[PDB]
Amino acid sequence: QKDAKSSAYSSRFQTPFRRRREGKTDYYQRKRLVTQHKAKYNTPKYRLVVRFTNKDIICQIISSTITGDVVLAAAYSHELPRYGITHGLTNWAAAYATGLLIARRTLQKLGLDETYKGVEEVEGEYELTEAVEDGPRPFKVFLDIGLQRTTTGARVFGALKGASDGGLYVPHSENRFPGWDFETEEIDPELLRSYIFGGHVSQYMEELADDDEERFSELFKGYLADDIDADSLEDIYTSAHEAIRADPAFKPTEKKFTKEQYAAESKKYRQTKLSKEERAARVAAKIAALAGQQ
């Protein structure tokens, strides 16, 4: 009885929004994220969109118009190898680094870089970008998590912490960070700092080397191949931090080709729609063959 979908059912069906059908955007949350105070007439509302694919992180600073969203700046985790992070390009430390990169990129673009210099010596403590006296207020963004699950110790809040320490004023509480304890409502600065600097992966490396060598050879094989040690990954994460705060300018790639060449090849492969004349030809051939019994 599964296939009882009458023409009346298909006629009275109201299809959801396209992004709701695709299961990509939550419009209930988007309305409250995007609806600006009307007496703040056209001043845009900025979202720090954070998305986590497999083996990649996407951080964007996005404003909204009627014709569609507009991107201010974008920072992908796959670009972090240029700054000095190649492994774990989706873990918590990489989320923090990508958030730091997007905040620095946005401040470089807006000219608010020297003022609101950010937190260069992070300690895993709770702190917001304090506005300077008689000076421009910090660039304010609101975290957009999409459908991801808000839970303590999540990499969305990792990217949040990275951007806030980079210099963006993004309002947040500290109870979603790693190090926050439920029984005692306090934040562990050292646990948060270790999660910032890759301690939660170095510790796993140590334990896995101690107990199960096969797992260490299987996963962390890139770490072994590059001869990266648990004591040195903290150094590489902080070196990436300083590199990002040095040159966040976003040099793009070369594409190795032209849009025209990509278009020509992909179009040549892709299946082409049948013309209406050949559609009628196929129908009439079916009449002539199947009905005629040859």
Binding site: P16, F17, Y27, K38, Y41, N42, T65
Partner: protein, 159 residues
């Protein structure tokens, strides 16, 4: 007894639409309203806060006040033998811009452009609008169009 509540006899007026129920798309929130804008009022049945009364459904007014999630609209309501000023505090879900003035602004821009071209050359702009004039003389031919004579048809049952 009789019942005259706030939403009395609004059964179909505030009905959402056919296959247009559910959430409200975000352009209605991205639209901005300034004091002096002319706005049509059409209540959204889905949103029950800042709802206009059924009198103001389909009425066009002028913004006088902009707040966090609302606009204040001036409307001239006919009461007795005169018009009274009414000030509605409506939400942008029920508010929408009016094209009645926008056509006029397009025409005034075109009039200014023609005025400038006249100040340049003097070619009888004829800015003023005019009603449809009676049709002028034309010559219709029969070449390939010989008239077809028609006659009334006889009555037949058809049933």
């Amino acid at each position: 007894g009789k019942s005259h509540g706030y939403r009395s006899r609004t059964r179909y007026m505030f009905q959402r639409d056919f296959r247009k129920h559910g959430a409200v798309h975000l352009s209605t929130y991205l639209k901005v309203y300034k004091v002096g804008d002319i706005v049509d009022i059409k209540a959204n049945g889905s949103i029950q806060k800042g709802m206009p009364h059924k009198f103001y459904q389909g009425k066009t007014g002028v913004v006088y006040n902009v707040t966090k999630s609302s606009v204040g609209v001036i409307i001239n309501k006919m009461v007795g033998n005169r018009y009274l000023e009414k000030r509605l505090n409506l939400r942008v879900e029920h508010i929408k811009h009016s094209k009645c003035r926008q056509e006029f602004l397009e025409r005034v821009k075109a009039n200014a452009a023609k005025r400038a071209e006249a100040k340049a050359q003097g070619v009888a702009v004829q800015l003023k609008r005019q009603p449809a004039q009676p049709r002028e003389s034309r010559i219709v031919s029969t070449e390939g169009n010989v008239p077809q004579t028609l006659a009334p048809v006889p009555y037949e049952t058809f049933i």
